[PDB]
Amino acid sequence: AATQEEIIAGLAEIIEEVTGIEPSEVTPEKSFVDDLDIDSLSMVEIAVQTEDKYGVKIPDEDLAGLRTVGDVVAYIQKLEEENPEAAAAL
Amino acid sequence: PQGLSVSAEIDTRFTTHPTALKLAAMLLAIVSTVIALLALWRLDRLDGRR
């Protein structure tokens, strides 16, 4: 199972490439639109660059239900613990 | 008098209009273009985002 401090560390390096927010602001209690001003037209880009590095297809059915970083870490944790087919081969 | 004549010839070389072939070939380079664009859009829509 992926640790929380590496999930956040992998999400911050994408948020910093897309928007430019320093990775010292990405904490598990920050909202994606109020605290960190990240419109959803940037959440789409984050979800694209996520799949373009680690094969992970986050459908827009679920891309709306992510309001905080804790939601992201919980979603990734549950999907990786449910499916044992996580390749993780680079 | 008879025989007197002055016959010029104007240079109207920019006053043209296309034929049926040049029109059928102009109204067929715009339909296939939008058809190809629609096909490329349908191919792009594979990622499941609307």
From Swiss-Prot, chain A:
Organism, scientific name: Mycolicibacterium smegmatis (strain ATCC 700084 / mc(2)155) (Mycobacterium smegmatis)
PROSITE patterns noted in UniProt: CARRIER (PS50075)
Q: What is this protein called?
A: Meromycolate extension acyl carrier protein
Signal peptide start and end residues? none
Give the record's keywords alphabetically: Cytoplasm, Fatty acid biosynthesis, Fatty acid metabolism, Isopeptide bond, Lipid biosynthesis, Lipid metabolism, Phosphopantetheine, Phosphoprotein, Ubl conjugation
Its lineage opens with: Bacteria, Bacillati, Actinomycetota, Actinomycetes, Mycobacteriales
Q: Which family does it belong to?
A: Belongs to the acyl carrier protein (ACP) family.
PANTHER family in alphabetical order: ACYL CARRIER PROTEIN, CARRIER DOMAIN-CONTAINING PROTEIN
Q: What does the record give as the function of this protein?
A: Acyl carrier protein involved in meromycolate extension.
